[PDB]
Design a protein around this motif. Structure first.
Motif, short mmCIF file in Angstrom:
data_model
loop_
_atom_site.label_atom_id
_atom_site.label_comp_id
_atom_site.label_asym_id
_atom_site.label_seq_id
_atom_site.Cartn_x
_atom_site.Cartn_y
_atom_site.Cartn_z
N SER A 27 23.14 15.83 3.13
CA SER A 27 23.06 17.14 3.76
C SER A 27 23.97 18.14 3.04
O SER A 27 23.71 19.33 3.09
N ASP A 68 14.64 19.31 7.52
CA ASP A 68 13.82 18.27 6.93
C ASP A 68 12.46 18.20 7.67
O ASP A 68 11.60 17.42 7.28
N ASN A 85 12.73 27.66 5.84
CA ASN A 85 14.16 27.39 5.69
C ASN A 85 14.81 28.48 4.86
O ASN A 85 15.88 28.96 5.26
N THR A 114 24.24 20.95 13.95
CA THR A 114 24.36 20.21 12.70
C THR A 114 25.75 19.65 12.63
O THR A 114 26.68 20.32 13.08
N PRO A 163 20.18 17.20 9.65
CA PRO A 163 19.05 16.88 8.75
C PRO A 163 18.58 15.45 8.66
O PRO A 163 17.68 15.05 9.41
#
Ligand SMILES: [Mg+2]
Ligand SMILES: [Zn+2]
Ligand SMILES: [Zn+2]
Ligand SMILES: [Zn+2]
Lengths: 98, 84, 43, 772, 114, 168, 49, 65, 133, 196, 266
Positions: free
Chosen positions: A11, A25, A32, A71, J66
């Motif tokens: 990442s 992803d 994005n 995140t 992610p």
């Protein structure tokens, strides 16, 4: 069997802006690229000292909210401490056509 | 030089542009307090007056239709077919 | 503010494309749309 | 370029645009503040005097008010400050500069403006809130959306100028465009999506809702249609209540793959007298389609009628969908447990097929295709298998998703999304390309440092195995990012390259227009085209029609066209026409049917010379098919009783109509031969559709029906000719320019080729001969 | 800025009646009542009650645009019956129904000990 | 390549053929080769078609080429538009390009030419050549702020006292 | 939370943007295109540290 | 910054519940999900109000005048 | 003002291909061998299974707007269980003395193949469809 | 916009009663169109939501990081544990009628951003105003109360329409227009017009 | 008893769970709408700020003060200032609240809805009392002050409805459901394998009979029986949200009957 090095975390290939994108992803490549341009124009608390500085233009969000979807990289980005939006209750529906 | 009425060869029908310009012109004149050649059946908008005058072919205007050489054919609004 | 302090300018072969060598060094998504697209790199 | 050829202007206004299902096609929502600023100078006249005096009294702050009074004297009275702004007594001839008001014509524009449709005349509608509101179906011509787009508004200042707007460039007029001789506005998004949903066989509406749906139609006759189901429980269908928006006289027929007169799959379309008989309404029917419900309506009923239909179709549909609802979720990307096993095992076998060609290439057994590297040949195969795979995997999911899938539902109506979108989301994203080739070795002999050298595997050269629903591996993510960046680069560049192409086309053509001699000339009077577009017709008035004569077997033609009154089998049966019995053996009449047939044969050879491939469908003026259809409902044509037509009535009637299809008028051989020429093709069509056998056996027309069909072809044809004044130059430039703006053996094509073409490029990129 | 005052939703304008009854041209014994400073709250309620009336042939309402708090209600009745009377009765029925609803809630609430 | 051809029985039927595809151009030479159809031979280089088959064929090739660019993107532009462009490039007697060199160097008005690309270098030359602009272009009347001689302004409007006195 | 990395010139904050250049003292071979007398070139952009 | 009085979506007063929530976490060690639910915040619209709040005011107070 | 067709058929097959509330029914007349029938029915309203004997009637009556109740006192021209109203859209001449007529009941399609009813069926918006059993 | 390149402006604002609602009494803050999602393929937006819905109920931070082992199936299972339908759908009732919607709406929290572009700082209108000194034409920009540019491409559309007089007006009356006196011998602006 | 019937399931200071049978869905909804939008409440509407040394903006604070719930029991005996005859406000039409706060403490000084004081004469009516549901008895946290941080302001609370501003909304979420078994076929259940397994069963399923598969579709069937839950904010008690809601809608209908009555005169 030749491995000389290992990736700390994949990442980390991402920059400051892309690192706020939840599940990047799972998005089409440019969507994005778009977010890492828009978030730069998103309102929120820019610095806690806003009340003591004279700048041409300052936009501060009344009630900022940390995101429900986050995140691991945001920890370092100070994002949950200084957010850019609010978690809205969102319906994806056809309503009055407005 | 001006083509004689008996030798005119342009369309017997009024062009979109002609009609738009006649309506524009009459409406303008009507709006500048020009004499109206029709019974205004309560009408007040000069374009709706113009439309009415053209509807009864009581518009006293003539279209000078220029040809690429410089010559021309004059056509009366009364004589032009309004199929538009 | 953060992303502005990590911005890269490239003035003037195929520079705009995301190169393999950009892996882990520059963000594959953070680039402008139009004129400066792929000439403004973000660390 | 910047102070003369274009300049900023007064009576202009600009703001963020937003959509509105409640505005009429041709109107524009104008914010109160904008209306209160923009002004129209109105001359004081007996007709308006009282009204004007009131707006003056109202003043600059009240909405229907005014800003200035212009005296004969020339000096301007500012109503904002004049001490006499109250006691202002008007005089005929003065001007009141009053606010912009509901129904004023205004020029609305979305920049760039590579279209005449990018600037259209709308009716004002003063509304609250700071945005310009537009009808959704008018979105497409402007090329607008509501993601933050702004639009320009210009206000005419003269009665003349206003007329120009209302009479030439008003939104309804602009519906059928000459760019592609089809409608440039259609039903979109919610209304398109809702229209499919409403018109399924399954879809039935209860009385309560039917009444609201009916009342919602602003021109509704007040007549409650008889329910399709009367007991147990009165129920109406979607088809039924949508048909209330469809005006009377509107006739439409369309056959899609597998359409029968019993339309089992609710395929194609059948609208009789502006009432739907079968099929589901979607993009092909109600979109900006060539055969369209819109194309027919504009052409048959008028631009003002068609513009009303847009509003009508949307008011019903949107209302219905408001109460039905429609959504889209992650569940719509999810595909079956076994379908996912079946997809995984599709990629798995393709992955081996690729290794097999790789092992074959490493063992030097591969045999290159003539005119290709051994490697070039290999990469072609790999790339081809991997795509065959992505598609298989996709088509697997597409099939496994039920009709309840909200994505499938949007794809089905044509409202949004295509096959690939389902495929990439549900099943597999696929191979990534840059410069046409797979991800190349940026690093010495490898794509990334996580790979071994000389790795030509799908995974190494950018094959994204996973769906978006599943997620991408870091390698897949970066390769997709490379491939993604390529598109953003051309989007960015193309934008200015495409812009300049447009300019050059416009500047080269500007001065070209049709003169009163039907000749296309420039500012030098030099003839460019002798007659506009070789046919002397306006492009809006043209439609794709089938030239029957062209194809089929020589025997099939014969059966369709031949009349032989001297043969007991090939005569017209006395069931076809009244004179049938007395017509047999008429040598004199047969001379006429011989001419008829001989011309039809002549025509066949000729058309086969023009269209070498045998292509029957061509864009021509006057939809003859529709005129016949109308004659049939207009005259309630009894497909049983015999016609009151003579062979002379048909044969000569057509011969005569032809002489009346006027494009050029001059009395002289040159101009007369010219007229004959321009009209050639249309007549072959006319003679094919109006041959004796056809008119009687097929159409079953009566004399009055026929007499009417003839007059209508004439009228339509005449309306169809170009208008002297038409600025065909700019038109043509913009008609090529605009499409170039939407542009994404291997030969240089698209934008860079158009660039080569326009530049009369000496050293071209892909020179090639095609040796037959 | 171009934002209308919030009271405009409920507070009647200067010289603006709650009701404006206009007659329907296209159909016999049909009328169109425009309700100013009103919404679905009342429209759908009235429309649904007129539907219960047997002598009522047609009934529907529509809020022509959301920026404005007003709705048009169209009533068609059998010959001899007046649509204004139809509206009057449906209005009454609603009140009487609500009256019982209140009475019934009140009784039931008083029985609770919380 | 697949070719639609009329059959003896009349109907058009698929009768595919063998066709060659080059990576380069030499019209003059490959045309004179035995075993080919010199009546059918095509090149994407219309500059060659022009040089070998005349200006008429030059026009037909130039259109074919333009048409392909549009239809390749799956778009439809009505014939007339492409035809006009193709004709304009043609009329002069050769291949007049849509560039500062081509069209902009014709006998049109000087202010017109100056509104695209060469501006000052066009007005100096306009001066020393003592050009006279007849003001028929749209560009001129726009610079001059006069009603252009286009659509609405392609004709003149007069009052007739005859017809005027007739209606009253 | 302010992170530094800018200057303060006449009261406005200023950020130096990194400028990307080709590294010097580097040997690079390039094929000089089809119409050229020279077919290949070895370049070295020599500069002092 | 500073707890919202009333949940945006339904308008249930949430202004009182802040300190009480912060207390059920330090003093009671309780997990966020139980504390919210203890405080009667059942609908997710109400839950998101407290759960996702960032009380920036507390930093703002750290500056002298 | 009167009846146009009457016969009792027997359903061979019932088909709801993707349709949840509607079915294409295939039937043949028990009386005349020449006679067959294809018809879309709201099976959620009036259910149909195969081998069901059904009386199928036409009739041009029992124009202007539609009225809902009062039908309590009014003569319900239905001695039938399920009734539809639709338009005749095509007159297929399927050889010999054989004819086929197409009916659309607001999208719900119908195809009747026979011979005799030359002196009955017409290309009219007015055509009711009555079904009992 | 959301954090998925899913931008837009407000079309209308509806009060709570007009809004569609869950049986539970919950109402959306925002209604976004289904038509966004397909062409765009912004799957993470849908996942963000599902995960955020679980997060809101569970009171745990929803990890949207992610490259992870979090699956749409995993989150679905957790949402079913909370009483909601696993794929995030919820049955909604129409606000105006109270009647259930034939469709079930994908409903849940999503992090939305407020962007710098607001209508009121954009809206602009002019009708005679300040003029430049040199060219004597309308000044530039909203800021200066400028007039808009009727530029070259706009001239073209007008020429295409055949709006001869509408164009003349835009270029003259509506902007630039001036009167000079010229000489009949040497067509120059030489004339000393002492018009008085 | 008569027409539509109620059957209360649960009660508290904050919630009313009940069953509404023998009613039109349209009526159930119209009541639901009114409860949300048209019931009058008292809420702060003007805020005059004398001093503010806080980290928060004058209007930021001002906004919050409107969202603070005030006792609106006797709201019915207060006039809307618009209808009142004074110049701005008075006792007959408003409640005046005062707020003076200062950071005496070295520690952070908190400002609560409890710190509000009524300065206007109440005419002895249950009005303007900041609603305190808080266990510790503080109510809504308005502000935080440090040391010399002073907040001195004045509030004018006025009668209003949720249509004007959502601050005058006396109700929180109103739960509303009917037909927990989709017997009416009012929804087409989206599914992957089984709609019954995939979609969670409602609480109310227990209060209705399951359809039993071996039965035809009841088309004749209509929507009556509504499972609702009314949640109060404080201003008015839960019961009175229902009652006043019923009454407002009743008054709203009466106005129409009356309008027709005045029209009959000409
Ligand atoms: Mg946009
Ligand atoms: Zn809430
Ligand atoms: Zn002179
Ligand atoms: Zn008072």
């Amino acid at each position: 069997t030749t491995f000389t090095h290992c990736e700390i975390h994949p990442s980390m290939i991402l920059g400051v802006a892309a690192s706020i994108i939840p599940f990047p992803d799972h998005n089409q490549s440019p969507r994005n690229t778009y977010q890492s341009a828009m978030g730069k124009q998103a309102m929120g608390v820019f610095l806690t000292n806003y009340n003591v500085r004279m700048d041409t233009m300052a936009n501060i969000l009344y009630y900022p909210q940390k995101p429900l979807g986050t995140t691991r990289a945001m920890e370092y980005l100070k994002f949950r401490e200084l957010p850019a939006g609010q978690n809205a209750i969102v319906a994806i529906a056809c309503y009055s056509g407005y | 030089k001006a083509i004689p009425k008996d030798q005119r060869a342009t369309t017997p029908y009024m062009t979109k542009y002609e009609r738009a310009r006649i309506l524009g012109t009459r409406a303008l004149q009507i709006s500048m307090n020009a004499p109206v050649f029709v019974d205004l059946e309560g009408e007040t908008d000069p374009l709706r007056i113009a439309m009415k005058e053209l509807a009864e072919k009581k518009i006293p205007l003539v279209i000078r239709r220029y040809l690429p050489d410089g010559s021309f054919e004059d056509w009366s609004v009364e004589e032009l077919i309004v199929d538009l | 503010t953060l992303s502005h302090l990590r911005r890269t300018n490239t003035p003037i072969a195929k520079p705009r494309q995301l190169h393999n060598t950009h892996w882990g060094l520059v963000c594959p998504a953070e680039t402008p749309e139009g004129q400066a697209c792929g000439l403004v790199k973000n660390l | 370029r910047g102070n003369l050829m274009g300049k900023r202007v007064d009576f202009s206004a600009r703001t963020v645009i937003s959509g509105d299902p409640n505005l009429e096609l041709d109107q524009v929502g104008v914010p109160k503040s904008i209306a209160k600023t923009l002004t129209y100078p109105e001359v004081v006249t007996p007709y308006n005097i009282d009204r004007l005096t009131q707006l003056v009294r109202n003043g600059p702050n009240e909405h229907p008010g005014a800003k200035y009074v212009i005296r004969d004297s020339g000096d301007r009275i500012d109503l904002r400050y004049s001490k006499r702004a109250g006691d202002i007594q008007l005089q005929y001839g003065w001007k009141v500069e009053r606010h912009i008001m509901d129904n004023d014509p205004v020029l609305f524009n979305r920049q760039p403006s590579l279209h005449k449709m990018s600037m259209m005349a709308h009716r004002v509608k003063v509304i609250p809130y700071s945005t310009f509101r537009l009808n959704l179906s008018v979105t497409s011509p402007y090329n607008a959306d509501f993601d933050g787009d702004e639009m320009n508004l210009h206000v005419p200042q003269s009665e003349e100028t206003r007329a120009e707007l209302s009479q030439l460039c008003a939104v309804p007029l602009q519906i059928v465009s000459p760019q592609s001789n089809k409608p440039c506005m259609g039903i979109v998004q919610d209304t398109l999506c809702g229209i499919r949903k409403l018109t399924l066989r399954d879809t039935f509406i209860e009385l309560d809702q039917v009444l609201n749906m009916l009342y919602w139609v602003p021109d509704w006759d007040g007549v409650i249609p008889t329910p399709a189901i009367i007991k147990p429980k009165p129920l109406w269908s979607g088809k039924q209540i949508l048909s209330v928006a469809i005006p009377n006289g509107i006739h439409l027929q369309r056959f899609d793959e597998g359409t029968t007169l019993l339309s089992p799959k609710d395929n194609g379309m059948l609208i009789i007298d502006g009432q739907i008989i079968f099929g589901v309404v979607e993009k092909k029917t109600v979109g900006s389609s060539n055969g369209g419900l819109i194309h027919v309506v504009t052409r048959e009923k008028g631009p003002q009628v068609c513009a009303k239909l847009f509003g009508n179709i949307q008011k019903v549909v949107n209302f219905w969908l408001l109460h039905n609802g429609f959504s889209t979720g992650i569940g719509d990307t999810i595909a079956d447990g076994p379908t996912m096993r079946e997809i995984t095992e599709t990629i798995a076998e393709a992955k081996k097929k690729v290794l097999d060609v790789t092992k074959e290439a490493q063992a030097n057994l591969l045999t290159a295709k003539h005119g290709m590297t051994l490697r070039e040949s290999f990469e072609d195969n790999v790339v081809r298998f991997l795509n065959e795979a992505r598609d298989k995997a996709g088509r697997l999911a597409e099939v496994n998703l039920k009709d309840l899938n909200n994505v499938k539902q949007m794809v089905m109506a044509g409202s949004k999304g295509s096959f690939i979108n389902i495929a990439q989301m549900s099943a597999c994203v696929g191979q990534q390309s840059v410069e046409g080739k797979r991800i190349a070795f940026g690093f010495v002999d490898r794509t990334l440092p996580h790979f071994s050298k000389d790795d030509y595997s799908p995974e190494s050269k950018g094959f994204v195995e996973n769906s978006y629903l599943r997620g991408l591996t870091p390698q897949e993510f970066f390769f997709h990012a490379m491939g993604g960046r390529e598109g953003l680069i051309d989007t960015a560049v193309k934008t200015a390259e495409t812009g300049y192409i447009q300019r050059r086309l416009v500047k080269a053509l500007e001065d070209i227009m049709v003169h009163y001699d039907n000749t296309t000339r420039n500012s030098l009077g030099n003839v460019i085209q002798f007659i506009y577009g070789e046919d002397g017709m306006d492009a809006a008035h043209i439609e794709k029609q089938s030239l029957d004569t062209i194809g089929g077997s020589d025997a099939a033609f014969e059966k369709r066209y031949r009349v032989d009154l001297l043969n007991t089998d090939h005569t017209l049966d006395p069931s076809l026409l009244e004179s049938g019995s007395e017509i047999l053996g008429d040598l004199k009449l047969q001379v006429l049917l011989d001419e008829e047939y001989k011309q039809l044969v002549k025509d066949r050879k000729f058309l086969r010379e023009v269209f070498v491939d045998g292509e029957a469908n061509w864009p021509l003026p006057v939809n003859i098919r529709r005129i016949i259809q109308n004659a049939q409902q207009t005259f309630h044509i009894d497909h049983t009783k015999p016609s009151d037509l003579t062979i002379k009535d048909i044969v000569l009637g057509v011969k005569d109509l032809q002489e009346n299809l006027l494009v050029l008028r001059g009395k002289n051989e040159i101009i007369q031969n010219a007229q004959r020429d321009a009209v050639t093709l249309f007549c072959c069509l006319l003679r094919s559709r109006l041959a004796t056998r056809r008119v009687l056996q097929e159409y079953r027309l009566t004399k009055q029906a026929f007499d009417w069909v003839l007059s209508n072809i004439e009228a339509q044809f005449l309306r169809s000719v170009v208008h002297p004044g038409e600025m065909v130059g700019v038109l043509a430039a913009q008609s090529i320019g605009e499409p170039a703006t939407q542009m994404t053996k291997k030969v240089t094509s698209g934008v860079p080729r158009l660039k080569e073409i326009l530049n009369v490029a000496k050293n071209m990129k892909t020179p090639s001969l095609t040796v037959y | 800025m171009n934002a209308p005052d919030r009271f405009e939703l409920f507070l009647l304008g200067e010289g603006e009646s709650k009701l404006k009854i206009d007659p329907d041209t296209k159909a016999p014994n049909a009328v169109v009542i425009t309700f100013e400073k009103e919404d679905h709250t009342l429209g759908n309620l009235i429309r649904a009650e007129l539907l219960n009336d047997r002598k009522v042939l047609f009934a529907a309402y529509k809020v022509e645009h959301p920026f404005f708090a007003r709705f048009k209600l169209r009533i068609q009745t059998t010959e001899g019956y007046d649509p204004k009377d139809a509206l009057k009765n449906a209005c009454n029925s609603i009140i009487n129904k609500l009256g019982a609803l209140k009475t019934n809630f009140e009784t039931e609430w008083n029985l609770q000990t919380l | 390549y697949d070719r639609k051809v009329p059959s003896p029985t009349g109907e058009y039927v698929k009768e595919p053929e063998w066709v060659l595809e080059t990576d380069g151009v030499n019209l003059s030479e490959v045309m004179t080769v035995p075993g080919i159809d010199p009546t059918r031979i095509y090149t994407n280089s219309f500059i060659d078609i022009m040089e070998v088959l005349g200006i008429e064929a030059g026009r037909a090739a130039l259109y074919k080429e333009v048409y392909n660019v549009i239809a390749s993107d799956g778009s439809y532009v009505n014939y007339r538009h492409m035809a006009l462009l193709v004709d304009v490039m043609t009329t002069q007697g050769g291949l007049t390009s849509v560039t500062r060199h081509g069209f902009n160097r014709s006998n049109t008005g000087a202010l017109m030419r100056c509104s695209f690309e060469e501006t000052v270098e066009i007005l100096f030359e306009a001066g020393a050549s003592a050009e006279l602009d007849d003001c028929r272009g749209v560009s001129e009347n726009v610079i001059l702020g006069q009603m252009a001689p286009i659509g609405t302004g392609a004709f003149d409007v007069m009052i007739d006292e005859e017809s005027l006195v007739k209606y009253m | 939370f302010d992170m530094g990395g800018y200057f303060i010139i006449n009261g406005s904050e200023k950020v130096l943007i990194a400028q990307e250049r080709s590294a010097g003292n580097i040997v690079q071979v390039f094929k000089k295109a089809a119409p050229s007398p020279i077919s290949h070139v070895a370049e070295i952009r020599s500069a002092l540290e | 910054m500073i707890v919202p009085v009333r949940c945006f979506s339904c308008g249930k007063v949430v202004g009182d519940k802040w300190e009480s929530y912060l207390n059920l976490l330090q003093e009671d060690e309780l997990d966020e999900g139980t504390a919210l639910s203890r405080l009667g915040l059942k609908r997710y619209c109400c839950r998101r109000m407290i759960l996702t709040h960032v009380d920036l005011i507390e930093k703002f107070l750290r500056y002298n005048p | 003002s009167n009846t146009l067709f009457d016969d009792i058929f027997q359903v061979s097959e019932v088909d709801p291909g993707r349709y949840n509330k509607v079915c294409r029914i295939e039937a043949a007349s028990t009386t005349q061998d020449q006679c067959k029938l294809t018809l879309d029915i709201n099976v959620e309203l009036f259910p149909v299974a195969a081998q069901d004997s059904l009386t199928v009637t036409i009739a041009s009556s029992l124009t202007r707007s539609w009225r809902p109740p009062q039908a309590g006192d009014r003569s319900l021209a239905d001695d039938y269980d399920y009734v539809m109203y639709g338009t005749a859209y095509k007159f297929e001449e399927v050889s010999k003395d054989l004819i086929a007529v197409y009916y659309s009941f607001g999208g719900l399609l119908m195809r009747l193949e026979g011979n005799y009813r030359n002196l009955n069926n017409l290309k009219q918006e007015n055509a009711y469809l009555l079904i009992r059993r | 916009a959301s954090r998925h390149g899913q931008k837009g402006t407000i079309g209308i604002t509806y009060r709570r009663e007009d809004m569609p609602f869950t049986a539970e009494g919950i109402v959306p803050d925002l209604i976004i169109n289904p038509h966004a999602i397909p062409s765009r393929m912004t799957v993470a937006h849908l996942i963000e939501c599902l995960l955020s819905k679980v997060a809101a109920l569970s009171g745990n931070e929803g990890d949207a990081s992610p490259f992870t082992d979090i699956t749409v199936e995993g989150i679905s299972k957790l949402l079913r544990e909370h009483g909601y339908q696993s794929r995030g759908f919820e049955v909604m009732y129409n606000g105006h009628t109270g009647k259930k919607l034939m469709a079930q709406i994908f409903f849940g929290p999503t992090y939305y951003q407020r962007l710098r572009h607001m209508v009121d700082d954009k809206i602009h209108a002019r009708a005679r105003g300040p003029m430049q000194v040199l060219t004597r034409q309308p000044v530039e920009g909203r800021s200066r109360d400028g007039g808009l540019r009727f530029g070259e491409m706009e001239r073209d559309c007008m020429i295409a329409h055949g709006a001869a007089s509408f164009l003349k007006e835009r270029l003259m009356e509506a902007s630039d227009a001036f009167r000079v006196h010229i000489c009949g011998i040497c067509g120059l602006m030489t004339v000393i017009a002492k018009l008085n | 008893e008569e027409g539509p019937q109620v059957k209360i399931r649960e009660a508290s200071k904050d919630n009313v769970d009940f069953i509404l049978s023998n009613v039109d869905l349209a009526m159930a909804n119209s009541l639901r709408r009114v409860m949300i939008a048209e019931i009058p409440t008292l809420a702060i509407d003007s805020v005059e700020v004398e001093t503010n040394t806080t980290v928060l903006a004058d209007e930021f604070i001002a906004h919050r003060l409107g969202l603070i719930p005030l006792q609106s029991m006797d709201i019915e005996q207060l006039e809307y200032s618009r209808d009142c005859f004074c110049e701005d406000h008075c006792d007959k039409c408003s409640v005046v609240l005062t707020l003076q706060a200062f950071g005496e403490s070295e520690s952070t000084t908190n400002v609560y809805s409890k710190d509000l004081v009524i300065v206007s004469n109440l005419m002895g009516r249950n009005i303007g009392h900041p609603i305190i549901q808080d266990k510790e008895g503080n109510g809504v946290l308005i502000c935080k002050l440090r040391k010399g941080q002073e907040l001195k302001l004045t509030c004018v609370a006025k009668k209003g409805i949720a249509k004007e501003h959502a601050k005058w909304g006396p109700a929180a979420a109103i739960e509303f459901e009917y037909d927990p078994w989709n017997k009416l076929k009012h929804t087409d259940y989206w599914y992957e394998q089984d709609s019954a397994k995939e979609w969670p069963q409602s609480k109310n399923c227990e209060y209705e009979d399951p359809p039993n598969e071996g039965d035809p579709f009841d088309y004749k069937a209509q929507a009556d029986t509504f499972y609702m839950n009314v949640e109060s904010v404080g201003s008015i008690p839960v019961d009175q949200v229902v009652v006043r809601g019923i009454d407002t809608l009743q008054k709203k209908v009466a106005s129409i009957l009356l309008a027709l009555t005045q029209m009959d005169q000409d």
